[PDB]
């Protein structure tokens, strides 16, 4: 048990399960948080091994709240999900750009496998 954490932040009930399933299927941890607040009042006291928030938020598509993210975990190799048209705000709207906001929809497994490679590469 225990081998990577990922806080999901989606206002849907399809990816949260998939992610949680895949994450809990790939041998990784996951925490559904369809409430930026929760992930805010939860990451305001600590920080996981990584995050995987989605849009929902405002920031045009919902990538502004990111502030809190970075403000909470300004180092975590977060990727986050995007709908292609929600990547131009994730790819071109960050200080220390170093993400890969999967062009959701994508292969959760591919996203999970990534973390497993990001949670490790983190030791650099």
Tab-separated table of C-alpha atoms in Angstrom:
chain	number	residue	atom	x	y	z
A	1	UNK	CA	0.000	0.000	0.000
A	2	UNK	CA	0.919	3.657	-0.323
A	3	UNK	CA	2.802	4.658	-3.452
A	4	UNK	CA	1.808	8.100	-4.673
A	5	UNK	CA	-1.074	10.437	-3.924
A	6	UNK	CA	-3.329	12.372	-6.269
A	7	UNK	CA	-6.059	14.782	-5.238
A	8	UNK	CA	-8.786	14.887	-7.860
A	9	UNK	CA	-10.740	18.096	-8.311
A	10	UNK	CA	-13.538	17.525	-10.795
A	11	UNK	CA	-17.166	18.600	-10.710
A	12	UNK	CA	-18.104	15.324	-12.358
A	13	UNK	CA	-18.547	11.726	-11.269
A	14	UNK	CA	-16.802	9.893	-14.083
A	15	UNK	CA	-13.138	10.826	-13.895
A	16	UNK	CA	-13.096	10.932	-10.111
A	17	UNK	CA	-13.999	7.256	-10.179
A	18	UNK	CA	-11.805	6.382	-13.136
A	19	UNK	CA	-8.883	8.268	-11.642
A	20	UNK	CA	-9.539	6.809	-8.212
A	21	UNK	CA	-10.023	3.414	-9.813
A	22	UNK	CA	-6.957	3.635	-12.023
A	23	UNK	CA	-4.980	5.297	-9.256
A	24	UNK	CA	-6.233	2.624	-6.887
A	25	UNK	CA	-5.656	0.121	-9.667
A	26	UNK	CA	-2.135	1.143	-10.607
A	27	UNK	CA	-1.163	0.917	-6.956
A	28	UNK	CA	-1.377	4.618	-6.190
A	29	UNK	CA	-3.413	6.780	-3.844
A	30	UNK	CA	-6.164	9.170	-4.866
A	31	UNK	CA	-8.524	11.573	-3.138
A	32	UNK	CA	-11.624	12.884	-4.871
A	33	UNK	CA	-12.168	16.545	-4.081
A	34	UNK	CA	-14.887	18.024	-6.260
A	35	UNK	CA	-14.556	21.209	-4.244
A	36	UNK	CA	-11.500	23.396	-4.694
A	37	UNK	CA	-12.331	24.455	-1.156
A	38	UNK	CA	-11.793	21.001	0.296
A	39	UNK	CA	-8.556	20.644	-1.633
A	40	UNK	CA	-7.858	24.105	-0.268
A	41	UNK	CA	-8.730	23.406	3.349
A	42	UNK	CA	-7.014	20.057	2.943
A	43	UNK	CA	-3.883	21.259	1.188
A	44	UNK	CA	-3.793	24.325	3.406
A	45	UNK	CA	-2.487	22.212	6.262
A	46	UNK	CA	-0.266	19.949	4.196
A	47	UNK	CA	0.416	18.673	0.698
A	48	UNK	CA	0.176	15.286	-1.030
A	49	UNK	CA	2.666	13.761	-3.439
A	50	UNK	CA	0.885	15.467	-6.311
A	51	UNK	CA	-2.423	16.866	-7.503
A	52	UNK	CA	-4.664	16.294	-10.500
A	53	UNK	CA	-7.229	19.079	-10.512
A	54	UNK	CA	-9.446	19.830	-13.485
A	55	UNK	CA	-11.231	22.908	-14.776
A	56	UNK	CA	-14.527	23.887	-13.191
A	57	UNK	CA	-12.852	26.955	-11.740
A	58	UNK	CA	-13.288	30.359	-13.396
A	59	UNK	CA	-10.028	31.514	-14.933
A	60	UNK	CA	-11.868	31.527	-18.241
A	61	UNK	CA	-11.906	27.742	-18.290
A	62	UNK	CA	-11.037	27.248	-14.639
A	63	UNK	CA	-7.265	27.375	-14.355
A	64	UNK	CA	-7.008	30.551	-12.313
A	65	UNK	CA	-7.677	28.989	-8.930
A	66	UNK	CA	-4.359	27.345	-9.713
A	67	UNK	CA	-2.974	30.163	-7.600
A	68	UNK	CA	-4.144	28.299	-4.522
A	69	UNK	CA	-2.628	25.112	-5.889
A	70	UNK	CA	0.822	26.585	-6.393
A	71	UNK	CA	0.213	28.759	-3.354
A	72	UNK	CA	-0.420	25.525	-1.495
A	73	UNK	CA	2.017	23.213	-3.239
A	74	UNK	CA	4.363	25.464	-5.229
A	75	UNK	CA	6.523	22.545	-6.295
A	76	UNK	CA	4.262	19.542	-6.741
A	77	UNK	CA	4.552	18.189	-10.291
A	78	UNK	CA	0.850	18.762	-10.828
A	79	UNK	CA	-0.474	18.092	-14.309
A	80	UNK	CA	-4.211	18.677	-14.172
A	81	UNK	CA	-6.653	17.817	-16.933
A	82	UNK	CA	-7.746	19.942	-19.868
A	83	UNK	CA	-10.134	19.785	-22.800
A	84	UNK	CA	-7.499	20.892	-25.282
A	85	UNK	CA	-8.984	24.373	-25.231
A	86	UNK	CA	-8.245	24.374	-21.519
A	87	UNK	CA	-4.523	23.813	-21.925
A	88	UNK	CA	-3.711	27.186	-23.438
A	89	UNK	CA	-4.359	28.448	-19.929
A	90	UNK	CA	-2.282	25.722	-18.320
A	91	UNK	CA	0.502	25.694	-20.884
A	92	UNK	CA	0.595	29.464	-21.211
A	93	UNK	CA	-0.219	30.712	-17.731
A	94	UNK	CA	2.394	29.595	-15.232
A	95	UNK	CA	5.596	30.935	-13.720
A	96	UNK	CA	7.830	27.885	-13.540
A	97	UNK	CA	6.140	26.051	-16.387
A	98	UNK	CA	6.825	22.350	-15.997
A	99	UNK	CA	3.474	20.633	-16.389
A	100	UNK	CA	1.785	18.517	-19.033
A	101	UNK	CA	-1.891	19.084	-18.331
A	102	UNK	CA	-3.050	15.982	-20.162
A	103	UNK	CA	-5.215	16.957	-23.141
A	104	UNK	CA	-8.257	15.402	-21.512
A	105	UNK	CA	-10.004	13.395	-22.238
A	106	UNK	CA	-7.040	11.044	-22.121
A	107	UNK	CA	-5.937	7.621	-20.942
A	108	UNK	CA	-6.218	7.823	-17.173
A	109	UNK	CA	-3.688	5.011	-17.083
A	110	UNK	CA	-1.383	7.279	-19.050
A	111	UNK	CA	-1.969	9.961	-16.444
A	112	UNK	CA	-1.470	7.525	-13.591
A	113	UNK	CA	1.640	6.043	-15.161
A	114	UNK	CA	2.888	9.603	-15.456
A	115	UNK	CA	2.556	10.379	-11.766
A	116	UNK	CA	4.368	7.141	-11.014
A	117	UNK	CA	7.110	8.744	-13.072
A	118	UNK	CA	6.632	12.218	-11.647
A	119	UNK	CA	6.434	11.109	-8.034
A	120	UNK	CA	9.812	9.509	-8.624
A	121	UNK	CA	11.455	12.128	-10.807
A	122	UNK	CA	10.464	14.485	-8.016
A	123	UNK	CA	13.665	13.432	-6.294
A	124	UNK	CA	15.754	15.793	-8.390
